[PDB]
């Protein structure tokens, strides 16, 4: 029985980040699903309950989005307490929360990703323009979809850099590539059917283009050290090339989120998906 198999599970939800509200929604949905499945799940909100009280549990299902939950901190405590848990470890999480460090890992593994430049007051805006070309996208390095602005002149720059400066002291200008954006979800370390972003299955890629994108994303997922489940975002350009965008090591499990979509396209109810995520902890 699932009560035996998993013992006491803590569903880690809410937390201290900007994304707390989304995390409460993921958490509730995951809790209800695990309970329907006969697992002994309990909400654990580390904003209200000391993380030392995790010692009362046999394992953790992490659905804390953003700062605290996705950046290696909560995984740090879980390692320290010797409690197994879902998703990526400390290293991968802390890399995955940083767009530039993720891309350097990707540049460093012979995987395609768009040129970029870190931009911090001191940097010269015409040395950026001449190297990258127009247009570019300005994004906060650490938010791990907020603060983004599209820059198509010298004029567009100064307003975009203060969009991102709210969310981050450190900001990257990345070369714009024209095309369509996709998300590739992961379950038990492997790629699930791709989803075009903006519904989005069918995604608009030939069987061939798709399985090639999934292979590429598998390697991106491994490179950065992600485990279990998560999403890689990618671009296809108007000449057919793929470009890796970013990694997400604790995706949404809200009723509008994309990983449930992709898991359902291959047989998983939402409750089955939740058991399968938790099975990584055995």
């Amino acid at each position: 029985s699932n009560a035996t198999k998993f013992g006491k599970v803590a569903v880690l939800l809410g937390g201290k980040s900007a994304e707390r509200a989304v995390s409460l929604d993921s958490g509730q949905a995951v809790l209800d699903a695990l309970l329907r499945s006969g697992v002994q799940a309990e909400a654990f909100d580390p904003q209200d309950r000391s993380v030392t009280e995790l010692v009362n549990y046999d394992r953790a299902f992490i659905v804390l989005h953003g700062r605290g939950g996705e950046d290696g901190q909560i995984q740090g405590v879980l390692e320290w307490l010797n409690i197994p848990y879902t998703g990526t470890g400390v290293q991968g999480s802390a890399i995955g929360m940083d767009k530039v460090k993720t891309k350097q890992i990707w540049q460093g593994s012979d995987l395609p990703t768009a040129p970029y430049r870190i931009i911090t007051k001191e940097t010269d805006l015409d040395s950026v323009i001449a190297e990258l070309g127009l247009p570019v996208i300005i994004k906060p390095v650490h938010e791990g979809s907020v603060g983004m602005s599209k820059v198509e002149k010298a004029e567009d720059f100064a307003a975009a850099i203060e969009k991102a400066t709210q969310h981050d002291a450190v900001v990257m200008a990345e070369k714009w590539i024209t095309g369509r954006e996709f998300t590739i979800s992961f379950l038990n370390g492997q790629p699930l059917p791709v989803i075009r972003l903006q519904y989005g299955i069918p995604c608009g890629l030939s069987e061939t283009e798709e399985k090639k994108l999934q292979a590429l994303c598998l390697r991106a997922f491994q490179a950065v050290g992600a485990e279990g489940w998560g999403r890689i975002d990618a671009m296809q350009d108007e000449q057919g090339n793929f470009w890796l965008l970013e990694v997400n090591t604790v995706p949404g499990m809200t009723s509008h989120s994309l990983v449930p979509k992709a898991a359902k396209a291959v047989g998983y109810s939402f409750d089955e998906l939740c058991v399968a995520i938790l099975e990584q902890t055995l």
Copy 2:
């Protein structure tokens, strides 16, 4: 004052890793220094203590070497307990414990580092030997345990079942220590101040190592090792986010060379936490 200013401080020492002995040594020295300077420091060894006790301190001086203190685990627990602490945060520490991820990020920031292949059992060497060139230096990714290859691969798998082979290079090994984010005088190794490096080649290496230190997310204090080859080009080797503070340790050398007693070093490191 100082008793007032820093409050109750926990010296994180000892622990459960292979480097425990060295940590105990670093820990006893830091505790002694802090206590001489009037700060209310107390030893906190995780082997004898409960995590729930960290909440009794206003700040922590981390001198836990290896697994636990150097890979972000303890940093994670302190972030969540809201305990300010010395040195590098979760990310920098997690990356710094890993020679390849560190070198990857360095490649990616256009900083010099020697070629390498990851090399585990069930891969053929002739791919590696062809690509890097003999001679070559195997080493565990996540920690010495080194050598200079059918048998040397299992000496690494003692420590870590993933190993890296690095293009060996002829030259002089250095280490460049950091305090309050800024680099300190450099030290040759196999004394080592003077290092044997012109004032001008010294500032070049420091400003480079500063960038390598920054690029990896490291903060406050630490060490970057580097090499200079026969033609005078520096190659970065690795980063260390919780260096020794034993009586033979390099960071105390480097800081004495610029006017810090061991005791003023310790206080200066603790000042990162305000």
